[PDB]
Amino acid sequence: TKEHKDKRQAEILEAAKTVFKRKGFELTTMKDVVEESGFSRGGVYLYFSSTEEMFRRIIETGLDEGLRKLDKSAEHQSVWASISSYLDELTEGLRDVADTLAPVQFEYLVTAWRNEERRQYLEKRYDLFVERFSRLLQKGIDQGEFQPVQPLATIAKFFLNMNDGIIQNALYFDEEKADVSGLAESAKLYLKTVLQADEK
Amino acid sequence: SPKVTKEHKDKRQAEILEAAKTVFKRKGFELTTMKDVVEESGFSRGGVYLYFSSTEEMFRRIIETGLDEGLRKLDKSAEHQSVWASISSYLDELTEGLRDVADTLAPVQFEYLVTAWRNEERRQYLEKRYDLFVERFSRLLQKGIDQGEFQPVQPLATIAKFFLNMNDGIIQNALYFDEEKADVSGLAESAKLYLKTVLQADEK
């Protein structure tokens, strides 16, 4: 029964998130999560067979929710306004990134260069982002907002790189040095230029 | 010019780091030992310990020489063409140079840098190098302003940091994905677009 299932899964994954943050990805076990969740062992192993399945689930849900937020916002304002609002939100949303799973996730992704199955998983998620973000940009073209001077897939990939760089800056440096606000303004300038967006 | 023993020391240090690189590519950072590097260098143990007390110090030295050499190339290029042409040429070299990046130390180095978020001394080390890069690249951009090439609409430091991020992202793309998917060429063209716009560069 989907909504019942979705809530139990969300609960198990919140417990897992808590353990992953505290212990890291590698040292976290099924028992740790089962204890932290307050559910029975069979209630957890119903929906998940391993911590790695859980870890990937959390990554996917975060990517999906971010794209959901962009898509929905673009049902209620311009595509350009939805993308700009995402970038403006970054200074405020990244204040306590070090206490989220972001760093544990970046460490997990970095070792994919020497683990082919993991690399292929990453690439699939990469591909999905490029496709979804390209589709958002195309909506903007269809609504007459944009006349891009580069391919949509290139713009999407560049966007992912600037976005990931901004998150990384907030993680590694104090606020003034990270300059999230200035990097987001630079990203906006790039997007406005490459998309020929004329909304202001 | 101190009876030239700075040159002799630089050359010996360079040789040891070449030996180290060879070992690091094979074994990774954590599994490489001093003995490994001593053997590979063809020098004596005392001849290596003269200059380095650990593999970590060597691994850092190799990251730094790479950054110093990237900056030197940019600065020297800008002595013989416009600052804009030098930055634009760098982004072209980068595209051509990333073919066999998986066979370099880059992925090992990226891994080492990532764990700085949970190792304060390593994070401080990273921050010192970040600051040096921002300062140097800002200086290059200022030369461009001096020569009437640019009128920037954002602070030089912000432009520098954005540049570093797009640069590292291009390298990462080449490391993690096949050639067509990585799209280094398109990303470099995007970087160029951004730089031209933010610098108000009017050269082609």
Side-chain angles (χ1 to χ4, degrees):
Chain A
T1 135
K2 205 157 183 53
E3 210 183 308
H4 152 118
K5 160 172 163 202
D6 286 340
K7 290 162 68 162
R8 310 218 302 200
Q9 273 177 124
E11 196 278 352
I12 295 151
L13 293 179
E14 284 298 331
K17 276 191 224 216
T18 290
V19 177
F20 282 141
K21 273 192 255 210
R22 194 175 59 228
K23 298 179 68 163
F25 167 64
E26 309 273 47
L27 301 183
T28 293
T29 71
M30 282 304 287
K31 198 194 177 119
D32 287 347
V33 176
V34 172
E35 181 71 352
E36 182 64 40
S37 68
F39 288 179
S40 65
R41 204 191 103 106
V44 177
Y45 271 88
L46 189 72
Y47 302 110
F48 306 109
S49 304
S50 82
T51 50
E52 182 151 19
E53 185 189 0
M54 296 183 172
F55 200 77
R56 289 186 180 186
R57 207 46 176 284
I58 290 160
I59 292 173
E60 292 164 5
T61 58
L63 173 57
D64 284 4
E65 170 70 8
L67 284 170
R68 192 197 64 84
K69 285 169 107 287
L70 275 168
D71 289 343
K72 293 309 292 190
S73 173
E75 295 179 4
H76 296 287
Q77 63 188 346
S78 72
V79 175
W80 175 247
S82 165
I83 293 162
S84 311
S85 277
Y86 172 85
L87 290 171
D88 288 344
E89 244 59 84
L90 284 216
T91 291
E92 197 63 17
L94 293 169
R95 289 256 230 274
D96 308 274
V97 198
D99 304 318
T100 67
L101 254 336
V104 176
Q105 295 169 158
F106 272 116
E107 271 188 58
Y108 173 84
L109 276 8
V110 82
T111 35
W113 76 273
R114 53 184 177 78
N115 178 333
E116 182 60 7
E117 191 279 328
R118 197 178 300 184
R119 197 200 62 76
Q120 288 177 188
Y121 167 77
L122 171 62
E123 187 176 288
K124 287 186 189 311
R125 293 313 299 187
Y126 188 70
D127 285 347
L128 204 69
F129 173 82
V130 172
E131 177 181 326
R132 296 267 319 262
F133 196 79
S134 290
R135 188 202 332 294
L136 177 67
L137 294 180
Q138 184 68 51
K139 175 174 189 173
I141 297 171
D142 291 351
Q143 299 181 155
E145 305 184 45
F146 307 142
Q147 260 200 78
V149 301
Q150 286 191 263
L152 299 191
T154 301
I155 296 162
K157 291 168 185 184
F158 197 79
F159 179 91
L160 193 59
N161 283 349
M162 340 187 248
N163 179 269
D164 284 353
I166 296 175
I167 294 166
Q168 283 159 39
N169 258 224
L171 264 171
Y172 293 91
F173 311 120
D174 70 62
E175 186 162 7
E176 207 234 69
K177 197 155 280 185
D179 195 12
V180 165
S181 189
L183 297 174
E185 284 311 305
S186 281
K188 217 181 279 191
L189 178 61
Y190 162 78
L191 287 169
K192 177 174 171 80
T193 302
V194 85
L195 294 170
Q196 303 202 93
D198 67 15
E199 187 186 324
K200 213 91 265 131
Chain B
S1 327
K3 333 209 80 121
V4 321
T5 15
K6 170 172 199 68
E7 191 188 316
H8 179 258
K9 158 175 161 198
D10 288 343
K11 264 178 92 154
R12 247 113 147 283
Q13 285 193 277
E15 196 270 356
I16 294 161
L17 298 175
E18 282 301 325
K21 272 186 227 213
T22 295
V23 176
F24 284 143
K25 268 184 250 224
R26 187 202 312 143
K27 299 188 68 160
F29 168 61
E30 309 259 65
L31 298 187
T32 288
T33 67
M34 285 306 287
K35 205 179 162 158
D36 287 341
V37 176
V38 164
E39 184 79 342
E40 183 67 31
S41 72
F43 292 179
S44 65
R45 208 197 93 102
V48 178
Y49 272 76
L50 200 71
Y51 301 108
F52 308 109
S53 325
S54 82
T55 56
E56 182 143 12
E57 179 190 356
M58 303 178 172
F59 193 86
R60 292 186 170 184
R61 254 322 236 296
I62 292 161
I63 288 169
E64 294 159 19
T65 58
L67 168 61
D68 280 5
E69 176 63 18
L71 288 173
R72 199 203 53 90
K73 279 171 135 271
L74 273 165
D75 282 340
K76 288 306 295 192
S77 173
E79 293 177 3
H80 302 301
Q81 67 187 342
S82 80
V83 168
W84 175 250
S86 145
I87 294 170
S88 167
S89 287
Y90 170 85
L91 294 169
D92 297 336
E93 255 152 20
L94 171 70
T95 304
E96 175 68 20
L98 260 34
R99 302 247 148 124
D100 313 72
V101 59
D103 306 330
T104 69
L105 254 344
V108 180
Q109 289 160 168
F110 273 115
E111 276 194 16
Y112 176 83
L113 269 6
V114 79
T115 39
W117 77 268
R118 52 186 184 77
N119 179 331
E120 188 50 46
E121 187 282 320
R122 196 176 299 172
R123 202 200 59 78
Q124 295 250 201
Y125 163 74
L126 171 73
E127 194 173 310
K128 287 197 186 252
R129 297 311 299 178
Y130 187 71
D131 282 344
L132 211 74
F133 166 81
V134 171
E135 179 187 339
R136 290 277 247 106
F137 196 80
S138 285
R139 181 159 172 184
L140 174 68
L141 296 180
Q142 181 68 55
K143 175 169 189 181
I145 301 180
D146 291 355
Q147 297 180 157
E149 300 189 42
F150 311 141
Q151 276 193 16
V153 298
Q154 282 182 262
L156 302 186
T158 297
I159 295 164
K161 296 164 184 191
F162 201 78
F163 179 92
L164 188 50
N165 279 173
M166 53 192 65
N167 176 277
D168 283 352
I170 291 175
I171 293 157
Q172 283 160 37
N173 260 226
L175 276 171
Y176 286 97
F177 311 121
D178 67 74
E179 189 164 18
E180 212 197 352
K181 203 154 267 181
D183 192 21
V184 164
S185 191
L187 294 176
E189 276 323 288
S190 274
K192 269 185 223 173
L193 218 181
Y194 160 78
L195 287 173
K196 178 186 180 62
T197 301
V198 81
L199 267 28
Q200 303 196 100
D202 221 321
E203 191 207 301
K204 207 95 273 140

